[PDB]
Protein backbone atom coordinates (compact mmCIF):
# COMPACT_ATOMS: atom_id res chain seq x y z
CA UNK A 1 0.00 0.00 0.00
CA UNK A 2 1.13 4.02 -0.12
CA UNK A 3 3.71 4.50 2.02
CA UNK A 4 3.43 6.95 4.56
CA UNK A 5 6.52 8.63 3.37
CA UNK A 6 4.44 9.93 0.06
CA UNK A 7 1.62 11.01 1.97
CA UNK A 8 1.38 14.77 2.98
CA UNK A 9 -0.69 15.02 6.54
CA UNK A 10 -3.19 17.77 7.02
CA UNK A 11 -4.00 17.73 3.49
CA UNK A 12 -5.48 15.49 0.66
CA UNK A 13 -2.28 15.26 -1.18
CA UNK A 14 0.30 12.50 -2.10
CA UNK A 15 3.56 12.84 -3.88
CA UNK A 16 5.17 10.74 -6.34
CA UNK A 17 2.46 7.92 -5.54
CA UNK A 18 1.02 6.80 -9.10
CA UNK A 19 1.40 2.46 -9.08
CA UNK A 20 -0.97 1.75 -5.67
CA UNK A 21 -4.28 2.30 -7.69
CA UNK A 22 -6.61 5.16 -6.40
CA UNK A 23 -5.30 6.10 -3.09
CA UNK A 24 -8.29 6.11 -0.79
CA UNK A 25 -8.40 10.23 0.66
CA UNK A 26 -6.37 11.47 -2.41
CA UNK A 27 -7.35 14.68 -4.06
CA UNK A 28 -4.51 15.63 -5.54
CA UNK A 29 -1.38 13.87 -7.35
CA UNK A 30 2.00 15.79 -6.84
CA UNK A 31 5.04 14.55 -9.68
CA UNK A 32 8.54 16.05 -8.70
CA UNK A 33 10.15 14.82 -12.27
CA UNK A 34 9.65 12.62 -14.67
CA UNK A 35 12.04 9.31 -14.05
CA UNK A 36 10.16 5.75 -14.18
CA UNK A 37 10.26 5.10 -10.31
CA UNK A 38 8.25 8.29 -9.38
CA UNK A 39 6.22 8.15 -12.44
CA UNK A 40 5.35 4.61 -12.54
CA UNK A 41 1.52 4.03 -13.14
CA UNK A 42 0.86 6.91 -15.01
CA UNK A 43 -0.78 6.83 -18.46
CA UNK A 44 -3.37 7.84 -21.20
CA UNK A 45 -6.53 6.52 -18.43
CA UNK A 46 -5.12 9.29 -15.50
CA UNK A 47 -8.50 10.54 -14.65
CA UNK A 48 -6.73 12.87 -11.05
CA UNK A 49 -5.31 16.15 -11.14
CA UNK A 50 -1.93 15.93 -11.64
CA UNK A 51 0.65 18.68 -10.11
CA UNK A 52 4.23 19.33 -11.78
CA UNK A 53 6.08 21.37 -13.84
CA UNK A 54 5.80 22.81 -17.02
CA UNK A 55 8.91 20.65 -18.41
CA UNK A 56 7.08 17.51 -16.26
CA UNK A 57 3.68 18.26 -18.32
CA UNK A 58 5.28 18.38 -21.67
CA UNK A 59 6.63 14.89 -21.33
CA UNK A 60 3.49 13.91 -19.52
CA UNK A 61 1.44 14.75 -22.46
CA UNK A 62 3.58 13.87 -25.08
CA UNK A 63 5.44 10.88 -23.99
CA UNK A 64 2.84 8.91 -21.66
CA UNK A 65 -0.32 10.67 -23.79
CA UNK A 66 -1.97 11.46 -20.10
CA UNK A 67 -4.89 14.11 -21.35
CA UNK A 68 -4.73 17.99 -21.46
CA UNK A 69 -7.44 18.49 -18.56
CA UNK A 70 -5.75 16.49 -15.89
CA UNK A 71 -2.08 18.03 -16.14
CA UNK A 72 -1.77 20.83 -14.14
CA UNK A 73 1.49 22.52 -14.64
CA UNK A 74 2.99 25.26 -12.31
CA UNK A 75 5.38 28.03 -12.73
CA UNK A 76 8.38 27.91 -10.80
CA UNK A 77 9.29 30.31 -7.59
CA UNK A 78 5.40 31.45 -7.21
CA UNK A 79 2.65 31.16 -4.46
CA UNK A 80 0.11 29.08 -5.63
CA UNK A 81 -3.01 27.49 -4.29
CA UNK A 82 -4.22 23.98 -4.83
CA UNK A 83 -7.51 22.96 -3.65
CA UNK A 84 -7.21 25.46 -0.82
CA UNK A 85 -3.38 25.10 0.50
CA UNK A 86 -0.95 27.57 -0.46
CA UNK A 87 2.35 25.65 -2.29
CA UNK A 88 5.69 26.94 -4.24
CA UNK A 89 7.60 25.06 -6.54
CA UNK A 90 11.37 25.17 -6.48
CA UNK A 91 14.16 24.03 -8.96
CA UNK A 92 15.75 20.82 -7.36
CA UNK A 93 18.86 20.78 -9.53
CA UNK A 94 18.21 17.06 -10.31
CA UNK A 95 17.53 16.49 -14.01
CA UNK A 96 15.45 18.74 -16.50
CA UNK A 97 11.84 19.82 -14.87
CA UNK A 98 12.58 18.15 -11.60
CA UNK A 99 11.28 19.80 -8.53
CA UNK A 100 11.35 20.64 -4.53
CA UNK A 101 7.75 21.60 -2.97
CA UNK A 102 6.52 23.38 -0.28
CA UNK A 103 3.28 23.29 1.66
CA UNK A 104 1.85 26.02 3.42
CA UNK A 105 -0.39 23.76 5.57
CA UNK A 106 -3.68 25.53 6.98
CA UNK A 107 -2.84 25.03 10.63
CA UNK A 108 0.94 26.99 10.22
CA UNK A 109 3.28 24.13 9.51
CA UNK A 110 5.56 24.24 6.64
CA UNK A 111 6.58 20.90 4.49
CA UNK A 112 9.40 21.10 2.14
CA UNK A 113 10.02 16.89 -0.11
CA UNK A 114 12.72 17.85 -1.76
CA UNK A 115 11.63 15.25 -4.27
CA UNK A 116 15.26 13.68 -5.78
CA UNK A 117 17.65 16.27 -5.37
CA UNK A 118 21.42 17.87 -5.63
CA UNK A 119 21.47 20.15 -2.67
CA UNK A 120 23.61 23.64 -3.55
CA UNK A 121 24.21 26.62 -1.56
CA UNK A 122 22.03 28.59 -4.17
CA UNK A 123 19.16 26.88 -2.64
CA UNK A 124 20.15 29.28 0.52
CA UNK A 125 18.81 32.45 -1.29
CA UNK A 126 15.66 30.81 -2.67
CA UNK A 127 12.19 31.58 -1.33
CA UNK A 128 13.11 28.79 1.48
CA UNK A 129 14.90 31.31 3.33
CA UNK A 130 12.04 33.54 4.15
CA UNK A 131 10.65 31.10 6.42
CA UNK A 132 10.81 28.33 8.98
CA UNK A 133 10.37 24.49 7.67
CA UNK A 134 9.00 21.85 10.47
CA UNK A 135 9.25 18.84 8.43
CA UNK A 136 11.45 17.77 5.37
CA UNK A 137 10.86 14.76 3.23
CA UNK A 138 14.46 14.19 2.23
CA UNK A 139 16.08 12.68 -0.87
CA UNK A 140 18.84 10.79 1.00
CA UNK A 141 20.42 7.97 -1.69
CA UNK A 142 23.41 9.00 -1.01
CA UNK A 143 23.88 9.46 3.12
CA UNK A 144 26.60 7.64 4.31
CA UNK A 145 30.10 9.21 4.34
CA UNK A 146 32.21 6.80 1.44
CA UNK A 147 29.86 9.41 -0.67
CA UNK A 148 32.00 11.85 -2.24
CA UNK A 149 32.13 13.33 -5.33
CA UNK A 150 33.21 16.13 -7.75
CA UNK A 151 31.35 19.03 -8.30
CA UNK A 152 29.53 18.69 -12.15
CA UNK A 153 31.82 21.08 -13.24
CA UNK A 154 34.97 19.78 -12.93
CA UNK A 155 33.65 16.18 -14.46
CA UNK A 156 31.91 17.83 -17.53
CA UNK A 157 35.59 19.54 -17.95
CA UNK A 158 37.05 16.51 -18.20
CA UNK A 159 35.15 14.67 -20.30
CA UNK A 160 35.79 18.05 -22.96
CA UNK A 161 39.24 17.63 -22.44
CA UNK A 162 39.24 13.81 -23.18
CA UNK A 163 37.19 13.65 -26.25
CA UNK A 164 38.62 16.95 -27.79
CA UNK A 165 41.89 15.35 -27.51
CA UNK A 166 40.87 11.85 -28.76
CA UNK A 167 39.32 13.38 -31.82
CA UNK A 168 41.84 15.79 -32.50
CA UNK A 169 44.61 13.25 -32.61
CA UNK A 170 42.54 10.65 -34.64
CA UNK A 171 40.05 12.05 -36.47
CA UNK A 172 38.09 8.96 -37.62
CA UNK A 173 36.88 8.53 -33.92
CA UNK A 174 33.25 8.30 -32.79
CA UNK A 175 32.17 9.18 -29.38
CA UNK A 176 29.23 7.33 -27.77
CA UNK A 177 27.47 8.47 -24.68
CA UNK A 178 25.15 6.18 -22.83
CA UNK A 179 21.71 7.52 -21.36
CA UNK A 180 18.32 5.55 -20.02
CA UNK A 181 16.63 8.43 -18.61
CA UNK A 182 16.19 12.62 -19.15
CA UNK A 183 19.44 14.00 -16.58
CA UNK A 184 22.74 14.43 -16.99
CA UNK A 185 21.98 16.12 -20.78
CA UNK A 186 25.36 18.01 -20.41
CA UNK A 187 28.08 15.28 -21.05
CA UNK A 188 27.00 14.77 -24.20
CA UNK A 189 25.89 18.78 -25.00
CA UNK A 190 29.33 19.86 -24.02
CA UNK A 191 31.40 17.26 -25.76
CA UNK A 192 29.64 18.02 -28.95
CA UNK A 193 30.17 21.68 -28.43
CA UNK A 194 33.62 21.29 -28.01
CA UNK A 195 33.32 18.92 -31.45
CA UNK A 196 31.38 21.53 -33.96
CA UNK A 197 28.78 18.23 -34.38
CA UNK A 198 25.17 17.53 -33.14
CA UNK A 199 24.34 14.67 -31.53
CA UNK A 200 22.81 11.41 -33.18
CA UNK A 201 20.09 9.71 -31.44
CA UNK A 202 16.74 7.60 -32.03
CA UNK A 203 13.92 9.21 -33.09
CA UNK A 204 12.49 8.34 -29.54
CA UNK A 205 15.25 10.19 -27.71
CA UNK A 206 15.06 13.07 -29.86
CA UNK A 207 11.26 13.22 -29.27
CA UNK A 208 11.95 13.61 -25.56
CA UNK A 209 14.70 16.00 -25.53
CA UNK A 210 12.42 18.40 -27.41
CA UNK A 211 10.14 18.59 -24.61
CA UNK A 212 12.48 20.02 -22.38
CA UNK A 213 12.78 23.61 -23.53
CA UNK A 214 16.11 23.83 -23.75
CA UNK A 215 17.60 27.01 -25.48
CA UNK A 216 18.97 26.68 -28.96
CA UNK A 217 18.38 22.58 -29.12
CA UNK A 218 17.23 22.33 -32.44
CA UNK A 219 21.03 23.81 -33.43
CA UNK A 220 22.40 21.08 -30.90
CA UNK A 221 20.45 17.32 -31.66
CA UNK A 222 19.50 15.56 -34.15
CA UNK A 223 18.28 11.61 -36.10
CA UNK A 224 20.61 11.78 -38.70
CA UNK A 225 23.35 9.71 -37.76
CA UNK A 226 25.12 9.56 -40.52
CA UNK A 227 25.97 13.46 -40.01
CA UNK A 228 27.05 13.13 -36.32
CA UNK A 229 30.46 11.90 -34.56
CA UNK A 230 28.79 12.16 -31.08
CA UNK A 231 26.06 9.22 -31.17
CA UNK A 232 23.79 8.41 -27.67
CA UNK A 233 22.95 5.22 -27.06
CA UNK A 234 21.04 3.09 -24.71
CA UNK A 235 23.08 2.78 -21.46
CA UNK A 236 22.81 -1.32 -21.60
CA UNK A 237 24.89 -0.95 -24.87
CA UNK A 238 27.38 0.76 -23.74
CA UNK A 239 30.10 -2.28 -23.29
CA UNK A 240 32.24 -3.79 -25.49
CA UNK A 241 29.92 -6.12 -27.56
CA UNK A 242 27.26 -3.15 -28.25
CA UNK A 243 30.11 -0.92 -28.95
CA UNK A 244 31.86 -3.24 -31.86
CA UNK A 245 28.18 -3.66 -33.22
CA UNK A 246 27.82 -0.21 -33.51
CA UNK A 247 31.04 0.21 -35.19
CA UNK A 248 30.17 -2.22 -37.38
CA UNK A 249 26.86 -0.09 -38.28
CA UNK A 250 28.66 2.75 -39.47
CA UNK A 251 30.02 1.15 -42.52
CA UNK A 252 33.87 2.55 -41.93
CA UNK A 253 33.12 6.10 -41.71
CA UNK A 254 35.24 5.10 -37.69
CA UNK A 255 37.75 3.23 -37.12
CA UNK A 256 37.63 4.04 -32.97
CA UNK A 257 35.07 4.72 -30.34
CA UNK A 258 35.56 6.49 -27.36
CA UNK A 259 32.60 5.51 -25.21
CA UNK A 260 31.47 7.56 -21.65
CA UNK A 261 29.23 5.90 -19.11
CA UNK A 262 28.20 8.51 -16.34
CA UNK A 263 27.19 6.47 -13.82
CA UNK A 264 26.18 7.71 -9.93
CA UNK A 265 28.82 6.81 -7.57
CA UNK A 266 31.36 4.02 -7.66
CA UNK A 267 34.20 2.90 -5.62
CA UNK A 268 37.08 4.26 -7.48
CA UNK A 269 35.99 7.77 -5.93
CA UNK A 270 37.06 6.61 -2.50
CA UNK A 271 40.37 6.07 -3.58
CA UNK A 272 40.79 8.73 -7.22
CA UNK A 273 40.80 12.16 -8.10
CA UNK A 274 39.18 12.70 -11.35
CA UNK A 275 41.87 13.96 -13.04
CA UNK A 276 42.97 10.37 -12.32
CA UNK A 277 40.48 8.65 -13.75
CA UNK A 278 41.25 5.67 -16.55
CA UNK A 279 39.23 4.13 -19.36
CA UNK A 280 38.89 0.01 -19.59
CA UNK A 281 40.35 -0.87 -23.22
CA UNK A 282 39.63 -3.88 -25.57
CA UNK A 283 41.26 -3.36 -29.26
CA UNK A 284 39.70 0.09 -30.52
CA UNK A 285 37.37 0.64 -28.40
CA UNK A 286 37.48 2.32 -24.52
CA UNK A 287 34.59 3.48 -22.31
CA UNK A 288 34.87 5.79 -19.59
CA UNK A 289 33.04 5.57 -15.87
CA UNK A 290 32.57 9.10 -14.81
CA UNK A 291 31.43 10.14 -11.53
CA UNK A 292 28.68 12.71 -12.73
CA UNK A 293 25.74 13.02 -10.16
CA UNK A 294 22.20 14.14 -9.56
CA UNK A 295 21.94 13.51 -6.42
CA UNK A 296 23.39 15.04 -3.38
CA UNK A 297 27.23 13.94 -1.51
CA UNK A 298 26.71 13.27 1.78
CA UNK A 299 28.90 16.83 2.62
CA UNK A 300 26.40 18.47 -0.06
CA UNK A 301 23.21 16.99 1.76
CA UNK A 302 24.71 17.68 5.84
CA UNK A 303 25.35 21.04 4.93
CA UNK A 304 21.64 21.85 3.35
CA UNK A 305 20.13 19.98 6.37
CA UNK A 306 22.45 22.25 8.86
CA UNK A 307 21.28 25.32 6.88
CA UNK A 308 17.61 24.30 7.24
CA UNK A 309 16.98 23.03 10.74
CA UNK A 310 14.02 21.24 10.12
CA UNK A 311 12.39 19.85 13.49
CA UNK A 312 11.88 16.79 11.84
CA UNK A 313 13.42 14.93 8.95
CA UNK A 314 11.57 11.88 6.87
CA UNK A 315 13.69 9.86 4.36
CA UNK A 316 12.21 9.15 1.05
CA UNK A 317 15.38 6.75 -0.36
CA UNK A 318 16.94 3.38 1.24
CA UNK A 319 14.00 2.98 3.58
CA UNK A 320 13.66 -0.44 3.00
CA UNK A 321 16.38 -2.00 5.48
CA UNK A 322 16.56 -1.83 9.19
CA UNK A 323 20.00 -1.16 8.94
CA UNK A 324 19.99 1.74 6.55
CA UNK A 325 17.21 3.51 8.50
CA UNK A 326 18.82 3.12 11.67
CA UNK A 327 22.59 4.54 10.43
CA UNK A 328 20.32 7.42 8.56
CA UNK A 329 18.86 8.21 11.99
CA UNK A 330 22.44 8.35 13.74
CA UNK A 331 23.78 10.90 11.03
CA UNK A 332 20.64 13.34 11.31
CA UNK A 333 21.55 13.95 15.24
CA UNK A 334 24.91 13.84 14.38
CA UNK A 335 24.12 17.00 12.92
CA UNK A 336 21.57 18.52 15.04
CA UNK A 337 24.14 18.32 18.07
CA UNK A 338 27.10 19.48 15.87
CA UNK A 339 25.20 22.43 14.63
CA UNK A 340 22.69 23.08 17.84
CA UNK A 341 19.10 23.08 16.91
NI1 LIG B 1 15.31 10.90 -10.10
Redesign the pocket.
Known amino acids: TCPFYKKIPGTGFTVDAFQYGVVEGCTAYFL??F?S??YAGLSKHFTFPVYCSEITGNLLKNKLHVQEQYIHPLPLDTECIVNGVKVVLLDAN??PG?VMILFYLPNGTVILHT??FRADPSMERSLLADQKVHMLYL?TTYCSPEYTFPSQQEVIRFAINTAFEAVTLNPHALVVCGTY?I?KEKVFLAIADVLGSKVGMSQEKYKTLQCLNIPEINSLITTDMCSSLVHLLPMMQINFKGLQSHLKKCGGKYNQILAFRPTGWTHSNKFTRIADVIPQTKGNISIYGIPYS??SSYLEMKRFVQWLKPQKIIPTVNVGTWKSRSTMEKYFREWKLEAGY
Open positions: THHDHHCAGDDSGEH
